[PDB]
Structures are given as structure tokens and as C-alpha cells.
């Protein structure tokens, strides 16, 4: 029952979850509450990370392909994505360029991106209408095309994701997705998430937001 909107048309939604902070506690003890919290912080502070592999999430994510390509680099997880063989685009708002000294107003940049999207999309449609197969015609669509996928990932792998994506060195667009993931993660695994931030999280932005 948890969806977060990201960018102009994207989202992250929680599809399912196995376990909670106690799943990592059982695993670390190999047995089927102030003590439990303490073991959580204890595991986290000593980098005993494998217990956290026994908490698992499945997300449904709508994201632009350029964001998805960074995301899918995370190999310790499962993905199923929408197929372009078998249509909406991320248009940055003007604010995206604030802090940059551009020769053309931020609003004009937005418009040019939006113009290319429009032109590429119409080329695609015309190709399809010509009888060009989809797998060929879609190649003209830009990297800001929205795709969707299911992402299944354990809490350990998700921490690693947060380390590298919830960080000002990461592209701002994916950091937004990472913040949504962290928020869901915090909801479901408050003890682990709190210990993670305190002892093991390597990025900067979840300390600031």
C-alpha cells in the first residue's frame, strides 16, 4: 500500500516484503526487544552484513531509461522490465538547472528537450504505421523514455544501492529514486535503517534529508 511519485511521471511502489528487523535477528542467531535492537546496531557496526540478506523487498518502479541503466548495474538483485520489442518521457523542470550558468534560460532548455521528445515520438509512430517493426522503430526514442520494472532485492543489497545512489555524486534523478527507496526501507525496517545511517551508510544525502 505504499507508492511515492518521483520526477514528473515516475514512481516507486512497494509490491511485497519478506521479514522485518527481526528476520535479521533470527538469522544472526540461527534461531526460529532492547536486546534485539542492540544486536541490530551491533551487526551493523561490525560490518556483519549477511543477516540483512534475509529481509527482501519487491518494488515496482517507473523510471526513465537513463535512470534504469544506472539502476540495473546493481547485479545482486532480480529485475523484470517492460519490453520495447513487445509512451511518456521525463521532461526536467527549469529548477533542474538552477545552480548552473546557462547561456539559454532554464525554461528554454525544458522546451528543447520537450521538442525532441515530441519529434522522436512522432517519427517512431510514423515508422510503426509504415510497417516498420517495433523493435526497429523504437531505436529513435530518447533516453528519457519512461520504462517500468519489478525489482526484488534483499536489505543488504538495498543498503549497497543506497550507499552509491543516495549520494550527491550520483545523478540527481536517481538520488530522488534512492530517497523513495530509503523511505520505504525505513518504514519496514526502522531498526536496521536507523543503525545503517548511524554506522554503515557511506553517502551524504540521507543524513541531510
Amino acid at each position: 500500500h505504499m507508492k511515492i511519485d518521483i520526477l514528473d511521471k515516475g514512481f516507486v511502489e512497494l509490491v511485497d516484503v519478506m521479514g522485518n528487523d527481526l528476520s535479521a535477528v533470527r538469522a544472526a542467531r540461527v534461531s526460529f526487544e532492547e536486546r534485539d535492537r542492540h544486536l541490530i546496531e551491533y551487526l551493523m557496526k561490525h560490518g556483519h552484513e549477511t543477516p540483512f540478506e534475509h529481509i527482501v523487498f519487491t518494488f515496482h518502479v517507473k523510471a526513465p531509461i537513463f535512470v534504469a541503466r544506472q539502476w540495473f548495474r546493481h547485479r545482486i538483485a532480480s529485475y523484470n522490465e517492460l519490453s520495447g520489442r513487445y509512451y511518456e518521457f521525463y521532461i526536467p523542470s527549469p529548477e533542474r538547472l538552477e545552480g548552473y550558468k546557462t547561456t539559454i534560460p532554464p525554461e528554454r532548455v525544458t522546451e528543447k528537450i520537450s521538442e525532441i521528445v515530441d519529434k522522436a515520438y512522432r517519427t517512431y509512430l510514423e515508422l510503426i504505421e509504415s510497417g516498420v517493426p517495433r523493435e526497429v522503430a523504437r531505436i529513435v526514442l530518447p533516453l528519457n523514455l519512461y520504462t517500468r520494472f519489478f525489482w526484488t532485492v534483499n536489505a543488504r543489497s538495498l543498503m549497497n544501492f543506497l550507499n552509491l545512489k543516495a549520494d550527491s555524486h550520483a545523478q540527481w534523478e536517481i538520488q530522488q529514486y534512492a530517497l523513495a527507496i530509503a523511505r520505504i526501507f525505513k518504514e519496514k525496517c526502522p531498526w536496521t535503517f536507523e543503525a545503517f545511517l548511524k554506522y554503515a551508510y557511506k553517502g551524504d544525502i540521507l543524513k541531510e534529508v
Copy 2:
């Protein structure tokens, strides 16, 4: 759901995320029973196995170390095991019963084999306890303990990699001892994912024993 295995072993279900429909939701990126089972068979038939990765199990398993070592070779999974260095170890060992060996032509009664194995276990254990009480640390004293010592672990595994495990272990070329664990894993799996299990047996299962049970 807990199943006894061998003399002191068990496979116990701790948790599961999803069911056959999780694999359907994922293949479609989004319930109609006949259509959804059909998709299941279609995925399994054409080897499109990633959707089954979105079903996941956690088990708690108690097994002898010679069995755990065969098990732990399956890398696409998560493990937490008892140590070893940090616990005093229980007097628990797999001693095969005479039925394990009847069938084999042996020059001594099957029962005397049981007795011989028991005797050595008992001696190893005594040595261990002696070294323990003498101050030798556990991590050193336990090296005298035989491979039939029972250990316990938590095993977290998705339905795709579990199917791989069943391919390899639910099979008469695998050691009899681990076959028995696989039969219990197959039962829990069938109970939680009947459609995936049936489609697996029908289309992708490479072993021999699961279609006998």
C-alpha cells in the same frame, strides 16, 4: 511446516514472500487462474526463469557438515550458520542406520558399521570435551570432530535458484543424505507454489526422484 530428516536433521520453513502470482505479476510488470497457470507453464517451457526470482523462501536447516558443504556450494542464495569458534558444540552426529548400507555387499554386518561409526564419533567427542576443559580454545579443539557433526543454518533462496538446487540435489546421482533434504525442500516448495512446482516437474526439472514421489 517442519520436516524431520535423517536421524536429527530437519528442514523448517521460516518465511516466504509471494506465491505463483508473484511470478505472474513480474513477468507482466503490473488473478485469472487458467490464464496465469498457462503463463507459468509458458515461462518454464521457454526457459524464461527470471520471473520466478521474485518468490523467495527462508528455511532453517539442521544437517551434518558433509551435507552442508554440498549445500553451501549453491552460491545464488543467502546463508547464516552456527560457529564453530563461538559456541560449545552439541553431541549431535549423523550415525547411519544399518538400512543405509544393507543393499551393499559388505564383509561385516551393516549393524557393526553403525557401531564402528558411533564408537569413533564418541571417541572424537570425548577428546574434544577434554581439550575444551583443558583450556584449548574451541576453534582449535573442534578440528578433531568428524564430518557427520550436525550444524544449523538459515537459508534464504528465491524460487529460481531453489529449482536449480532441486535439479542437482533431488537426483539419484547426488548423495542419498542430501536427496532426503531435497525431498523436504520440494514438499514445502510444492505447498507454497503448486503451479510453479507442477510446471517445473513438467518442463524444466532435470532430476529423477521428484517424479517418483
Copy 3:
């Protein structure tokens, strides 16, 4: 070790390094029985034996590094193979060259199309040209590259290194060297198989005969 195969108009697969060979698998399998290498007949026989019974772990000790140039829509299909290592050209950090996969008119064989295949090719070029010049002007106005590149189409060429062991490479071939896979990636898979054949003749023959699931490699 070095090989290079050109693919599509401007792509390639280049072999950068390799560890091991058919005998690497033979040795690793042999340790099971407390044995090492034997002789050519027996060792070749063993490779086939391993392949027939699906004993795939010994082939993990054969390892390749490729340097691949490919359009993003192909790279995206390729990078779904998780049991492997990648490093790729960055659109955030580098300024991208004008290189796009333009399909030739023949790519449309057996399709009845409304406009001549040549027009499709030229329509694809036009949109590409337009998207690219927009990217350049965004870059020139001080737009960061990571934003500017979002207007670039899926047929932009990217480059990457791919390190992959023989087992995982066989898994790749089963799925990509197959007529249900998109033609463009089938072409890269053919190049991959060709290099694999060259460096591991026995494994490769054995794979084709006993295990390979696709159709295009026959």
C-alpha cells in the same frame, strides 16, 4: 590474445584478454577425482562428458575480457547478464561522439512497408541528426552533460569492457544467439561465439553438440 570483429555499421567486439583454455576446465574437473591432466583423447572426451551431463562449474575457470562497441538498446539487453563484470562509457562524464546505429535498407527484408526501406533509413538518420545537434547546443549553453544527453536516442553507440567466464558466456549464447532475440544482438552473439570457438575449440564444439539451446549457430 587479440581479435576484433566489426558488427552493424560502426560497432565491434574485440577480445582484450583471456585466462585459461579447454585444459583449464579439464584440470578443474579432474581435482574431484584427485587427478590432473591426462592425454588429448581422454581430456577431450572429458570436456564432452562434462557438457553432456550439465557439469558446468569447471568451465567457470575460463575467463574472457571483451571491449564492445554497441548501441544502447543492445547494451541494455546485454547488461541484464548479471554474472559478469562491466565498465562503460559515461554520458555523465564524457561528451558523446556523433555515432549512431543506422540500419541499412536490408534490415527491413520481408517486411511490407508503406515507404521504401531507404526512406526508413533516412528518416532514422534525420531524427538522430536532430537529436544530436540539440544535445550539442544544450552542451554549448552550459547544460550539464548528464542532463543534455537525455535527448539522445537508443541507437547511440556506447563502449564497454565485459569480463565473463565460459559458463556465463554459454548462458549468454543460449539466449542471444537465437532467432527469437533481436537481430542486432544476434549479430554481437555471433561475434562472441566466433571468438569463443577460436580460444576454446573443444568446449565450443561440445557446447554446440550437447548443450547449446539456440538455433543460429548451426
Copy 4:
């Protein structure tokens, strides 16, 4: 082949290796649409990658080792899943009379109410007994896979290990560390020594910036 003896009958032996320090430089440079530069430039990128946590470029360096080690050691080792293993089988082979017998020096450091050499002989006695029983079981037609269960955890096994440099570093972090059992520390020292020999720059940079363990910053 680089082969280093460990414990009383143990060894770690380099079988093969793909790539070198410059393999990581090449992989990293592709991000900036670049290749190799020169000596002092490329060594500095190695340091830079390690200092900032860019680990993936080190995946393109790969090693194969042949390791002989006690089963209690292999069991800890094999927990490292991002690697490839093939091991001697007690199902398919008649096992050799080779067991790890700790030297008396393994025990000083600890107060014991029996002398360390007594500990050493108590271990041998149990090994001898178990091994003789094993042979007797085999001799009676007890199949190997069953007979071997009486053999103690200190039995030597052998395996091939193929592992990339990033995952080798993870291994050094965990096993070349005083918290790991002394026996496996010793293997991890040999591993480190071969690593260092093949990839001197990656290795120095790893010690300087990324290595979490304690012992490799003191054992040469």
C-alpha cells in the same frame, strides 16, 4: 608456478592470472572515453579508484589458485560466493592420510592444564583412529561417501579457486584479519603475497586506502 607452503601440509599455488594493474586502468578510463596514458598517470588513477571506492574496474583482473587446506578452513573460505570453486570429492576419491596437526606453538598464548605437546598428540591419536576406521570401512565395501563421515575436520582437501581482484580484496578484508581464525589468516597471507606480486600498484593502493583488516599492514 608460485607455490607457498602453509601449515604442515598446506599450500596456495598460483595457477593462472588474467590482466594486471593496467587492466583496471583501461576499464576505468572507458568511462571518460579514454584508454591508457602513462606510468605515473595510470598508477595515480589506481590510487584514486581505491580512495574513492570505485571497485568495479578491479573485476577485470582475475586469478586462479590451487589450494590445499583443512576442511574447517575450506568451509570458511567457500562462504565467499563471488568466486568459482572445484574441489576434491570424498564421494569419488579414496582420501589420503593428510591431516592438519597444530604445532605446540599454536597453543601457547593460552593457559592449559596439559602441556601443548600433549594437545598435539591427543589430536594425532584421534586422527589416526578415525583414519584407520575409515580405511576399515572402505575395505569392507562401505561406499566411500559414507565411510568418509568419520574423518575429522582437520582433513586436508584441495580445490581450484578462480576469483577476480575486487572479490579477492573482499576476501583479504575478512580473512587477513586478527578476528579470523589463525589458520585461515595464514592462507590469506600467501594469497596477499601472490596478489602483491602480480598487481603491485593495486595492492599498495588497497593497503593505503581500502583494506579493513589489520595484519597485512604489519606482515610484509
